[PDB]
Design a binder for this molecule. Structure first.
Ligand SMILES: C[C@H](N)P(=O)(O)C[C@H](C)C(=O)O
Ligand SMILES: [Zn+2]
Length: 251
């Protein structure tokens, strides 16, 4: 069918669901919009609208009720700075470096990350309880089917630069979250992995009776990057926050 051309400015590599934000790769566009409260019960915890909707779907699916509470969603630069500096004072430098992202290097500043905890009257804000049992683990096991990944695993500390965090989940979107789950990938690993699949050798994601999904990487040019898409598809494009774009085509 008719193919259409998408023309992207280089700065668009710093927007999208698949941004890799870490010590190496800072947030460069602060202008997150479409933030909404994640839940009526927690008006001060904001997330990107589509992400809040997905969270509700997961809570519905596992019948979480009130057993899981959102502890921290979107954080502004001033909030992240206060948390970091406060942790320096309370917890010391070593702990802070391991458990708090540098300001402008936190996924919380994107609206795509959420810290979750067991519903108990006293919850540690910095390290909330989200065990590998019961309802919390039901969430954790369902998450990749809906677009979420547990961001900071114990076995990936050396490449994420952050200690094991049971509670911190990152939205990357389906099917990326599932591909990461299947391969045991951190987001760092997935960001490298997908660069092996260019437009002329796309990655194929398929299961049962739903449509096939193709995924590929497009390196950013210094100026305008040109991408072609079928008019005959639902598609997504994201920057990777580093050097290019990831394109997702629903067949
Ligand atoms: C501050 C909490 N421990 P976190 O938000 O789960 C840490 C994370 C690396 C960040 O500061 O973005
Ligand atoms: Zn977090």
């Amino acid at each position: 069918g008719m193919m259409k051309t998408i023309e992207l400015e280089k700065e668009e590599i710093y927007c999208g669901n698949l941004l890799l934000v870490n010590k190496n790769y800072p947030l460069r566009d602060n202008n997150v919009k479409g933030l909404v409260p994640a839940d009526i019960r927690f008006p001060n915890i904001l997330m990107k609208r589509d992400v809040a909707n997905v969270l509700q779907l997961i809570f519905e699916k596992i019948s979480a009720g009130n057993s899981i509470v959102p502890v921290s969603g979107y954080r502004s630069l001033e909030e992240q700075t206060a948390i970091y500096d406060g942790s320096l004072k309370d917890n010391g430098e070593d702990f802070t470096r391991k458990y708090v992202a540098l300001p402008n290097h936190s996924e919380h500043q994107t609206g795509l990350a959420i810290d979750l905890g067991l519903n108990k009257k006293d919850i540690d804000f910095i390290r909330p309880d989200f065990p590998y049992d019961g309802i919390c683990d039901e969430f954790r096991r369902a998450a990749p089917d809906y677009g979420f990944t547990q961001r900071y695993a114990r076995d990936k500390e050396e490449i994420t630069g952050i200690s094991h965090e049971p509670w911190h989940f990152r939205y990357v979107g389906y099917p990326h979250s599932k591909i990461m789950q299947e391969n045991g990938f951190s987001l760092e690993e997935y960001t490298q992995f997908i660069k092996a699949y260019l437009e002329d050798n796309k990655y194929l994601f398929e299961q049962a009776h739903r449509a096939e999904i193709e995924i590929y990487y497009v390196p950013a040019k210094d100026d305008k990057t040109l991408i072609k898409i079928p008019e005959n598809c639902v598609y997504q494009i994201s920057g990777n926050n580093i050097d290019g774009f990831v394109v997702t085509i629903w067949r």
